[PDB]
C-alpha cells in the first residue's frame, strides 16, 4: 500500500455574504472528498459513492447531530477570537485534523487551526502542547492546556482512532484509491522542451529534465499536478534549450514504482 491520509476540515466565516454558509466541514481520503456538511443544509452527506454504499443511515444521522454541535462551537470560538483581535468585518476560522498511514507502516497525526488563513494554533501530540502564534492564540493555548484529559483524548484519537477510520475507508474505496493508471508521456517544443504527462492515477508523480545525465533543478520549470476532470491527472515540466551547444536532454517521470525516460533526439 502506498501512503494514504484522512483529513477533516472546518471553515467558519464571521460575516458571510447572503446565501453563503457560515460553516462548512469536508472530509478527504487522499485527494478524494468523502463527506460534506454545511450550515445551510445542516446535513452530513457522502461525497464519494463508495462512502454512501458502505455507511448506513445511522452513521449520517449521528454525525449530522455532532456537526450541528460543532457548528455552534465554531461560531462561539470565532466570535471570541474576533473580539480579542478587535477586528471588524468578515473573518475566517479553520481547523484541520487528520492522520497519515505511510507505505512503511509508520503513522503521523496532526491537528491545527488558522485565523484568516494563517496558522493560529498547532497541536504537538508528543509534547502534548499547543504552539501559539500570537497573544490571542496564547490565551487559548493556556485554557486548552489546563485540560490535560482533552489533550490525551486528542492524542489517542490521532494515533489510534483516526488510523482505524482511514483503514476502514481505504477498504470501502479500494477500487478507486488503490488502483494505478500509468501516465501517457510526450515531449514537444514550444525555445523550450515540454515534457507532458496525462491520464495517470494516483496524482503523486515526479517529472524532471536531465541534461547530459545531470539534474539542474534551478533550470527546470515544474508545472502543477492538475485534475483532468475524469478522475485522472496531468502534469508537465519544461527546460530551456541552449542554442550555442548540443546537449542530450531527457525527461524522467516516476509514478507508482515505475520510472520512464524519454530521450530527446
Amino acid at each position, epitope marked *: 500500500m502506498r501512503t494514504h491520509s484522512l483529513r477533516y476540515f472546518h471553515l467558519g466565516v464571521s460575516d458571510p455574504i447572503h446565501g453563503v454558509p457560515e460553516f462548512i466541514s469536508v472530509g478527504y481520503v487522499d485527494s478524494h472528498p468523502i463527506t460534506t456538511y454545511d450550515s445551510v443544509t445542516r446535513q452530513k452527506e457522502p461525497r464519494a459513492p463508495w462512502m454512501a454504499e458502505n455507511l448506513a443511515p445511522d452513521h449520517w444521522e*449521528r454525525y449530522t447531530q455532532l456537526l450541528r454541535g460543532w457548528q455552534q462551537m465554531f461560531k462561539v470560538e470565532l466570535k471570541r477570537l474576533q473580539r480579542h483581535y478587535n477586528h471588524s468585518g468578515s473573518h475566517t476560522y479553520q481547523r484541520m485534523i487528520g492522520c497519515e498511514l505511510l507505505e512503511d507502516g509508520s503513522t503521523t497525526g496532526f491537528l491545527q487551526y488558522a485565523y484568516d488563513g494563517q496558522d493560529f494554533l498547532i497541536f504537538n501530540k508528543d509534547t502534548l502542547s499547543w504552539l501559539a502564534v500570537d497573544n490571542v492564540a496564547h490565551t487559548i493555548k493556556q485554557a486548552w492546556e489546563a485540560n490535560q484529559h482533552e489533550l490525551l483524548y486528542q492524542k489517542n484519537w490521532l494515533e489510534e482512532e483516526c488510523i482505524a477510520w482511514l483503514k476502514r475507508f481505504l477498504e470501502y474505496g479500494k477500487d478507486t484509491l488503490q488502483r494505478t493508471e500509468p501516465p501517457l508521456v510526450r515531449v514537444n517544443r514550444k525555445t523550450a522542451l515540454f515534457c507532458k504527462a496525462h491520464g495517470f492515477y494516483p496524482p503523486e508523480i515526479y517529472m524532471t529534465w536531465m541534461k547530459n545525465g545531470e539534474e539542474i533543478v534551478q533550470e527546470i520549470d515544474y508545472g502543477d499536478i492538475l485534475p483532468s476532470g475524469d478522475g485522472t491527472y496531468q502534469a508537465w515540466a519544461s527546460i530551456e534549450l541552449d542554442p550555442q551547444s548540443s546537449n542530450l536532454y531527457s525527461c524522467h517521470v516516476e509514478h507508482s514504482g515505475v520510472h520512464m525516460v524519454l530521450q530527446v533526439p
Partner: antibody
Amino acid sequence: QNIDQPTEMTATEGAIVQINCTYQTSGFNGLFWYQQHAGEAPTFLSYNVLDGLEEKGRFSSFLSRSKGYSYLLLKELQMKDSASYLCAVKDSNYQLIWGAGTKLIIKP
Amino acid sequence: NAGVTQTPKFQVLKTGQSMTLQCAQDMNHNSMYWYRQDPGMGLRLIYYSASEGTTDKGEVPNGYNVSRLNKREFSLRLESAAPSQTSVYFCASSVWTGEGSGELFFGEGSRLTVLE
C-alpha cells in the same frame, strides 16, 4: 459492544478495594468512572484514555487499552464510599456505553 | 449555580396517562441527555440534544419525545404511559459534544411508577 463489571463487592473499612471494568467496543475514545450513592445522581470520578494509572485523592483509575480493561482503586475505605460505581466507555461514534454498575458494601 | 434541576422527584401514573419531565441547566452547557436507569442494566439513552436547536433519538426512544426548548431546558414527554416505563429518569448535560473527555453532570433523578 459490551461492558462488564461485577454486580457487587464487599470490603472492610480501612482496607483497599479494586473495582474491575472490561469492555469490548467498536473503537475507543476513553473510559469514565462515576460514583452513584443510593437514591442520588451519578457524579464523575475519573477519565482514562491512554494506558496507565491516574491518582485523585484516595481513588486511582487504571487503563489497559490492549486488554480492554480498567479498574477503579479505592484506598483507606470509609463508610461513605458505600455506593455504586459505574464504568462507561465512549465508542468510535463518541457514544457512551454504560456498565450495569458495581454496588460497593463496606463493613464497619 | 444550581447545576442540573429536574422535576418531579416522584410520580405515579396510570397506564395511558401523559406526563412531562422538566430539566433545566444553568451551566451554559450545550448538550443535554435523558437517560433511564433500571435494575440490572446500564443507563440507556432515550433522546439527546447535541446543541440548542437539534435533538435526536437515543437507544430507547419509543414511547417518548423531547423538546429542547432553549439552551437551558430539555423536557421529556411520555404521551401515553405504559408499565414498562416505570423507571428512574435522569437528565444530564455536558459542556458540548466535541469534548471527547468531557464528563456528564446529572440531575437528581425522577422516579416514575406506571400502574394499570
